[PDB]
Design a protein around this ligand. Sequence first.
Ligand SMILES: *[C@@H]1O[C@H](CO)[C@@H](O[C@@H]2O[C@H](CO)[C@@H](O)[C@H](O)[C@H]2NC(C)=O)[C@H](O)[C@H]1NC(C)=O
Ligand SMILES: *[C@@H]1O[C@H](CO)[C@@H](O[C@@H]2O[C@H](CO)[C@@H](O)[C@H](O)[C@H]2NC(C)=O)[C@H](O)[C@H]1NC(C)=O
Lengths: 23, 23, 49
Amino acid sequence: VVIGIVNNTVYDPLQPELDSFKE
Amino acid sequence: VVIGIVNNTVYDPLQPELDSFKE
Amino acid sequence: SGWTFGAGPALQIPFPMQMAYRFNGIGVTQNVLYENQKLIANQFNSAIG
Ligand SMILES: *[C@@H]1O[C@H](CO)[C@@H](O[C@@H]2O[C@H](CO)[C@@H](O)[C@H](O)[C@H]2NC(C)=O)[C@H](O)[C@H]1NC(C)=O
Ligand SMILES: *[C@@H]1O[C@H](CO)[C@@H](O[C@@H]2O[C@H](CO)[C@@H](O)[C@H](O)[C@H]2NC(C)=O)[C@H](O)[C@H]1NC(C)=O
């Protein structure tokens, strides 16, 4: 819906921290 | 770089919660 | 004391800490001042001269 929105990715600061300890 | 900074520790509210369930 | 002595009892406060919360009042985070405290003081000392 937003006019002018562009494509990118946001670095979630939890999943790499949450998965590194368990895996 | 900061003038006047002191030494302390910050309590992360995630790691004790993240580790207690798995361990 | 900053702006506090115009609203009640004067409260002591470091000047570099007062300026950090005056930068916070215009739209720049407090980390700007401390990372450039020496440069800003030189700017202020030179400007007032
Ligand atoms: C931004 O990215 C999305 C997703 O990568 C793009 O949506 C795709 O559009 C193509 C062509 O319309 C479809 O074939 C894909 O199936 C779509 N992907 C998804 C996940 O829906 C979108 O086109 C991109 N926009 C811009 C401006 O780059
Ligand atoms: C604040 O803590 C840091 C780290 O605990 C101190 O840095 C240490 O300084 C000594 C002496 O210069 C070194 O031998 C250590 O190797 C340093 N530790 C690290 C992790 O780099 C720092 O000196 C402390 N500052 C104050 C004012 O207490």
